[PDB]
Amino acid sequence: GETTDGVYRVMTRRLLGSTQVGVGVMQEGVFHTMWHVTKGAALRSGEGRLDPYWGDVKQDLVSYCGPWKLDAAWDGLSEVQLLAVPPGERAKNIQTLPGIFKTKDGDIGAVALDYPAGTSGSPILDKCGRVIGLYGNGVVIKNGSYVSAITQGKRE
Amino acid sequence: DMYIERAGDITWEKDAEVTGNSPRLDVALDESGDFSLVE
């Protein structure tokens, strides 16, 4: 299968035609996506198979072939880019200044950008091109707009 | 059966389209991984 670093679409042929259910990041031989995209199922990459290695429903994250490798964090001040990969459309970078999710367990960066559900798992980057989290787990606020957390895992 | 297909490189694009606001929200995270608004 293809193990080149980069952003990938996660597809399924179970429904009508070929449907994009999400997106993920290949880095250091490990595939990273959100748990709600795959529900922890195995994935295919050409003729090869990717088996889950770690996952957590509460963080809404899952890694395949190895442990979670992404450890960069939003600095709390700078603009970032969502490398959005929408269903049936080309990868596109969108720059934005994150807002904040304030929780009883601390603050998390959040991006106020609205893309289809199939874009979940698209990476959010800093100015060095490092992945600071994945887009796709968030909330719908008063005016009906979507705000995603910047969801990042822990590198053991 | 789920499969993956390469979509691109991960790089910062100089002069990308700049949009979106920066809301400061009070939220709660439940055991199922769902975020909700705290009012």
Ligand SMILES: CN(C)c1cc(CN)ccn1
């Ligand atoms: C999971 N994503 C990206 C969503 C979710 C919603 C749910 N209102 C709307 C738009 N995008």
